[PDB]
């Protein structure tokens, strides 16, 4: 089969090696980007670790009729959108107008508006196809077949015990990191969504292979997707660990005005402060082969099987060192990678796609997630199942 | 009914212009210059809100000696005062030794040494004029404290501790007074103090104490080279001891640590969409203008002297300190108690050349810290124009 990938960044490098780790599935593998660099840099890679060839191109993902060309050129199974999120629905929009697959990972009311169309061209469009979304709506999924009649609470509980070996530094573009601290908290209990002070909301949880961990109460995008899919659902949270020397560095970063997102004028010149505070910080890239530390992610649950009470934790603990040394990434691109490179086999092997005679724009929860778990396990996000 | 040309129309020249124009007795004439005429004209319009006469504003560049001189000769002032930037005071001193005009400076705080202004000594005592250095608090009134001391209270003068905290609120959740490169060097410089003949060195905020100042308590104190402790272990004989103390607050440190650690202090240009910038410049545009934060600011400063040493043979301590209101300093003159105390020892100390108590005659000319004068009216001015000293003897 022959896969079209958009996007070449951390995460996309994890997607594009994991399937040149499966040849047996993927045999053509194109990489298009706005960057050459990195097409080529992941390129590089992948040869200097037996992954064999793939190919490289340009495109401005942003350009419809760019994307059908290339489309038309290769005629991919699947498009696999780990470009910027803002192209979502233009990458969306080239698929339907060739009836090609896609999966993106890295409001869904926009991309679910093209069920219809994509039902029409009998294509599948796959979301969230990352983590968290994406594995942990899995586990959801797969705890509502084989542990619960009725799931009555999911707390998603996402922990990065990760050392960069900076005094400070993110890894992403600086302005998510100003949203999950200073963005409402969200969450849904018994039919409603509730929203919280920033921050508001805190818990210390043990997170198995780790330890104590403060956990704050934050929106997440699956919320939303699981909420509406998973029946009988009393009560959604989603929490991320923060450490007191992160958030006191966020604090004192408000205060001053650096994580300002409107310009200001500096001698002349007009500077967004956030955008210079990505200036002063290191690239996140370049970090890649200094983390050490674990990664802990997964989904609590209570309800009911058989009219009797049962808990389930189900999680997936993942290291920085040793994703860098398979891959060449951190532990963050590789839970978000791998998973899309399983979707992608899913389609390609026909598990998700015309087995079920599927067409139109699914979560990963509404599918068939079991040949989907036993993949993860295979590519090296095997989870742990705690029930009680 | 004297002349005088203030250089400077910042925050502490606001207070020593204002404090001129309170004294009308003496200062005749108050002559205000700058490259700023905004800011003169400020301070102008706020002398004249508050009942104290008019200034005269003049531009002139400070850096440029043949402007400076032309200026002086035009007013004829009896003393100059430089509340400039401080790289411009050897260009003012060069000035005041041309046309032969007694000079004071203040607010140099902006790794110190007197050398170069020590070094215009002869030439003038040549031309028999007087250059007054650190007319401030602290160097000045601090320096006036040690003076007063071994002249009524010791002997000899063993210890001298300086210690300055600064307890004002200014409602911002973090804000300097001062351009952010001065917080910066306060942080990240090495400490530096004189015990038994030598000048040892520390790492930067690494001695610290925990120190009660009267009517604000106790405070976290912190080691730091300071400029007065150079010319106060020159002058005062028999000192074994001269450190300098300043407090910060947990909360302070702990912004300044986390700037540090994104980069925002650094003073080296970086590239940010095809432009240079310096991120702690780019800091002082973040951060609230000091002028601003006057108007909010409550609480106390107390800046003070303890000493130790031998009085009639019997062990005695002295602790000589000043207490000073943001609040009441706004409301008298619109600056806070940085400006303010920095700024009244200045006037004060134009006053004592004015009315001939600080003269150049009879082989007194030349170049002087506070210490080497007569501090007796001196330190009677300062408590009469709003800086009374309280005095602990033990």
Redesign the interface.
């Known amino acids: 089969h022959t896969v079209l990938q958009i996007g070449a960044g951390g995460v996309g490098s994890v997607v594009a090696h994991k399937m040149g780790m499966n040849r047996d599935v993927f045999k053509n593998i194109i990489l298009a980007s706005r960057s050459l660099d990195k097409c080529y840099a992941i390129k590089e890679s992948m040869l200097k670790k037996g992954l064999g060839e793939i190919g490289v191109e340009q495109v401005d993902a942003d350009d419809t009729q760019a994307l059908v060309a290339l489309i038309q050129k290769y005629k991919p199974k699947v498009v696999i959108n780990v470009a910027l999120p803002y192209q979502d629905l233009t990458i969306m929009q080239a698929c339907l107008e060739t009836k090609t697959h896609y999966i993106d990972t890295a409001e869904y009311k926009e991309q679910w508006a093209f069920d219809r169309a994509y039902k029409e061209a009998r294509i599948l469009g796959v979301l969230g196809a990352g983590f968290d979304p994406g594995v942990t709506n899995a586990y959801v999924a797969h705890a509502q077949r084989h542990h619960f009649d009725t799931i009555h609470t999911l707390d998603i509980l996402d922990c990065n015990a990760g050392d960069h070996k900076r005094?400070?530094a993110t890894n992403f573009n600086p302005e998510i990191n100003l949203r999950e601290v200073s963005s409402k908290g969200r969450y849904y209990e018994n039919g409603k969504w509730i929203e919280t002070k920033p921050l508001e909301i805190k818990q210390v949880w043990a997170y198995p292979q780790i330890g104590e961990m403060d956990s704050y109460l934050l929106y997440h995008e699956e919320l939303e997707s699981l909420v509406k899919n998973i029946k009988g659902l009393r009560r959604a949270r989603f929490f991320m660990t923060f450490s007191q020397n992160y958030l006191?560095?966020m604090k004192?970063?408000?205060?001053?005005?650096?994580l300002?997102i409107k310009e200001?004028?500096?001698?002349g010149?007009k500077?967004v402060?956030i955008?210079?505070?990505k200036?002063?910080?290191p690239d996140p890239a370049t970090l890649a082969k200094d983390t050490t530390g674990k990664t802990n992610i997964g989904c609590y649950m209570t309800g009911i099987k058989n009219n009797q009470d049962k808990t389930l934790y189900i999680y997936n603990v993942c290291d920085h060192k040793k994703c860098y040394e398979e891959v060449g990434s951190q532990a963050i691109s590789y839970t978000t990678g791998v998973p899309a490179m399983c979707a992608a086999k899913m389609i390609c092997n026909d598990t998700w796609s015309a087995d079920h005679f599927r067409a139109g724009v699914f979560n990963i929860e509404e599918l068939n997630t079991d040949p989907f778990m036993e993949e993860l396990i295979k590519q090296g996000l095997p989870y742990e199942v705690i029930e009680r």
């Open positions: 005094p400070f006191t560095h004192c970063l408000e205060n001053v005005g650096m300002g200001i004028e500096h001698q010149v500077i402060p955008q210079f505070l200036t002063l910080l």
